[PDB]
Amino acid sequence: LTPLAQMAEGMERQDVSIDKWTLHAKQNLSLTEKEFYQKVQRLKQEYRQYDWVIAREDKMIKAIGTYTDKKNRTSFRLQLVTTLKKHNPTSYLLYEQMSLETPDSWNDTYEQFERETLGIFQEKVVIFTCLNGHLDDNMNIVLQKKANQLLNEFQVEHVVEPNFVSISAFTDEWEEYIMTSKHKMNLQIALRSHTVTVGTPIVTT
Amino acid sequence: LTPLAQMAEGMERQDVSIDKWTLHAKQNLSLTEKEFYQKVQRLKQEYRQYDWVIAREDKMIKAIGTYTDKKNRTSFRLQLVTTLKKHNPTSYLLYEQMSLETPDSWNDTYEQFERETLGIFQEKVVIFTCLNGHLDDNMNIVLQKKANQLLNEFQVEHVVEPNFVSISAFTDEWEEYIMTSKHKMNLQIALRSHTVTVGTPIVTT
Missing domain, CATH: 3.30.360.40 (YwmB-like)
Known part of the structure; x- marks a missing residue:
């Protein structure tokens, strides 16, 4: 069923070798500097697994949270961004899952991601699937x-x-x-x- | 009809680009050294177009006649060989046509070659067709x-x-x-x- 399963399986049949898959979701938000650091503080409390870096390349602020799941051979990134210079600021929260390895079940991983999405964003959001792969160089x-x-x-x-x-x-x-x-x-x-x-x-x- | 026409046209349809075609015929013969130079002498009289080289890498003798037709963008080789050391010698005459260019008519050139063959060999001989070509490297x-x-x-x-x-x-x-x-x-x-x-x-x- 899931677009991930289908894109994957379609790619194999078409002789495309899968290098990397990523799932991502993004939610537009509206954040004062003050609200931004509030949200960051809540994210660090709720998701203790991430290592955080704050980057400020002006006039924008980026909180990047990073974590790799070694058991499930999978990587996560949670990223809060706001543009600082505006009295009506454009902000977003981005959640991203990635791996260089085919998972046990394309479908269980998509359903998992979708699931976590709702917990993180508290709203149903569009989920983006992207696969990278290469063609067989066996000239034979x-x-x-x-x-x-x-x-x-x-x-x-x-x-x-x-x-x-x-x-x-x-x-x-x-x-x-x-x-x-x-x-x-x-x-x-x-x-x-x-x-x-x-x-x-x-x-x- | 001719195997040349068919091999060519089959190759194009299959996206093979033709680099070179050659037609050749060979006739086993039995030639004393004396008969060999007799035959060579007759060949030089009858086919004035060739430039001849005699090569003797022992114990074998090779008369190689060479000529390129600039009008018809085509090349010829007539070659008489005998193995010198034997009181029952194995000899042959080889006639060969070659070009790096597609001819006006695959069929008229094969029929021409076949025709010349009979004049040269005074017997109906097997005619060998061979095409060389490359595959399209346009990765697009x-x-x-x-x-x-x-x-x-x-x-x-x-x-x-x-x-x-x-x-x-x-x-x-x-x-x-x-x-x-x-x-x-x-x-x-x-x-x-x-x-x-x-x-x-x-x-x-």
């Missing part, structure tokens, strides 16, 4: 696929090496053939990591 | 394809840059969405030359 997989596309392009018998693929084949498409040591062939396809070689009856030397 | 084409596979993986709106692709999309698959400046979206796919990023409703910063 692309070499082999095209080989087949070509084989079918035409209409076998086979190989495979470090960065190499070769095929012998047959089709009732041409006059010529050769029989030698058990068997009987008239098309050679050869890819190398990109190089293509196509020959009738064989690619010679 | 693979980035875009996977993007779509992913888009359909899920169920848009679009971009494209030097080595980059991004999409905004929508599906009735989840609760959330956003409307801002004309339009309405809840999936962002982003590839970079390999990097993948997938987000709901948007990939933020």
Whole structure:
């Protein structure tokens, strides 16, 4: 069900390798300097797990809370921001979960986050899901696929090496053939990591 | 019809870029040293276009005739070989056509070669076709394809840059969405030359 489960599982099927997932939620707020440090003080009482840093790059103030859950191989960030210079100040609270590792259950972790969200924000907020991943650099997989596309392009018998693929084949498409040591062939396809070689009856030397 | 036409056209359709084609034919023969130089002498009379080199890396002798047709952007090699040390010698004549350029007509060139073959060998011989080619290194084409596979993986709106692709999309698959400046979206796919990023409703910063 959860967008996390779906995005993940969709990415695998599409051969995307997952490097990192993050879940985040944000709540706009309106905070005086005074209210800001009040909120910070409450956050430090309620969520003792975080290590806090206050940063003030003017005219803005940032309370950044940080914590990594080693048991669950997951990281959290709670961040309160206000822009200091305004008699109608724009502020927000941001809650963020992150990991470099696939969790036991994509669904239990999303439902957990959503759950914690309500405790932190005391309101139902939009939850943002973002996955990072990479494509498979194994040049053996692309070499082999095209080989087949070509084989079918035409209409076998086979190989495979470090960065190499070769095929012998047959089709009732041409006059010529050769029989030698058990068997009987008239098309050679050869890819190398990109190089293509196509020959009738064989690619010679 | 000709295997050359077919191999070529099959390769293009399969996105293989052709670097080089070669056609060749070979005829086993049986040649005394004396008969070998006789044959060479006849070849030099009959085919005045070739420049000849005799090479003798023992105990074998090689007459290599070479000629490039600038009008037809095509190259020829006629090669007579005998192994010198034997009182039953194994010899052959090899005729070879080559080009780095696609010809006006794959079919007219194969039929031409076949034709010349009969004049040279005075017998019908097996004709060997071999193409060399490369795969498209334009990383833009693979980035875009996977993007779509992913888009359909899920169920848009679009971009494209030097080595980059991004999409905004929508599906009735989840609760959330956003409307801002004309339009309405809840999936962002982003590839970079390999990097993948997938987000709901948007990939933020």
